[PDB]
From a paper:
Kinetochores, multisubunit protein assemblies, connect chromosomes to spindle microtubules to promote chromosome segregation. The 10-subunit KMN assembly (comprising KNL1, [name], and NDC80 complexes, designated KNL1C, MIS12C, and NDC80C) binds microtubules and regulates mitotic checkpoint function through NDC80C and KNL1C, respectively. The 10-subunit KMN assembly consists of three complexes, the 4-subunit [name] complex (MIS12C), the 2-subunit KNL1 complex (KNL1C), and the 4-subunit NDC80 complex (NDC80C) (Bharadwaj et al., 2004, Cheeseman et al., 2004, De Wulf et al., 2003, Desai et al., 2003, Kline et al., 2006, McCleland et al., 2003, Nekrasov et al., 2003, Obuse et al., 2004, Pinsky et al., 2003, Westermann et al., 2003, Wigge and Kilmartin, 2001). Finally, MIS12C is a binding hub that connects the other two KMN complexes to CCAN through an interaction with [name]-C (Gascoigne et al., 2011, Hori et al., 2013, Hornung et al., 2011, Hornung et al., 2014, Liu et al., 2016, Maskell et al., 2010, Petrovic et al., 2010, Przewloka et al., 2011, Screpanti et al., 2011).
In addition, we report the crystal structure of the isolated Head2 domain determined at 2.0 Å. The buried surface areas (Collaborative Computational Project, Number 4, 1994) for the [name]:PMF1 and [name]:[name] pairs (4,209 and 3,575 Å2) are much larger than those of the four other interfaces, which range between 465 and 1,905 Å2. Both subcomplexes start with N-terminal helical hairpins that interact in four-helix bundles (defined here as “Head1” and “Head2” domains for the [name]:PMF1 and [name]:[name] subcomplexes, respectively) and progress into a “stalk” region.
Author numbering:
A (entry chain E): 24 to 99
B (entry chain D): 116 to 197
């Protein structure tokens, strides 16, 4: 109880995850909702806009989590 | 920059709940970067795009609740591996 020093308040606000594969599978499931946007998109830009939206979606999640305290691109 | 998303999610919430929130914020984030590039061509009004996008945001929030109770989100925080 009294032994040891106390931890300093939280400074890394990224979601602390452990499994890179499990996050990837979660993103695959949620990717269906990005695809449903194609209905409201015009055929002129639909395909590149959906690729862009999907990649923006996955990037925002990946850059806001840590994999065992490490960044996404540097973990396994 | 882009790390504002997780900085804006309360740390008083369980980390699995924060991941569910992050899923929705990221979805809304990708919506907002795409919207300025949409114009009112015939058959595709920006009004109808916002209706579809906000409808999907609420379905995603329900979907994430389901992932929170069926263990799928929890798998992101488990390890029994090398």
């Amino acid at each position: 109880g009294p032994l040891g020093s106390s931890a300093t308040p939280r400074e890394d606000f990224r979601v602390r995850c452990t499994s890179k594969r499990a996050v990837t599978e979660m993103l695959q499931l949620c990717g269906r909702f990005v695809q449903k946007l194609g209905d409201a998109l015009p055929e002129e830009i639909r395909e590149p806009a959906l690729r862009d939206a999907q990649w923006t979606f996955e990037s925002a999640v990946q850059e806001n989590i840590s994999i065992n305290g490490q960044a996404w691109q540097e973990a396994s | 920059g882009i790390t504002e998303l997780s900085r804006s999610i309360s740390v008083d919430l369980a980390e699995s709940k924060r991941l569910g929130c992050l899923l929705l914020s990221s979805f809304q984030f990708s919506i907002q970067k795409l919207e300025p590039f949409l114009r009112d061509t015939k058959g595709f009004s920006l009004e109808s795009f916002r209706a579809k996008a906000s409808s999907l945001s609420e379905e995603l929030k329900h979907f994430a609740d389901g992932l929170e109770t069926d263990g799928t989100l929890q798998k992101c925080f488990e390890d029994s591996n090398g």
